[PDB]
Amino acid sequence: EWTLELLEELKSEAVRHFPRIWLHNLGQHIYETYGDTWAGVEAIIRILQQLLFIHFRIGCSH
């Protein structure tokens, strides 16, 4: 629902700043740790957000 809309926004932004296969491989690691549970969605949302924030603090050249 709302959680999936939140994640889709993160995934759209993230793919503009980090290579797609590398984000995809992050997703596989989370799948290995959480299966298909919502805790997996909730972890990746937090990880994608924090990765974006440190990226913008470092300096986004994109």
Binding site: L4, L7, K11, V15, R20, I21, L23, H24, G27, Q28, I30, Y31, G40, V41, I44
Partner: peptide, 6 residues
Amino acid sequence: NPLEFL
């Protein structure tokens, strides 16, 4: 597919 980026 929420954890996938293709």
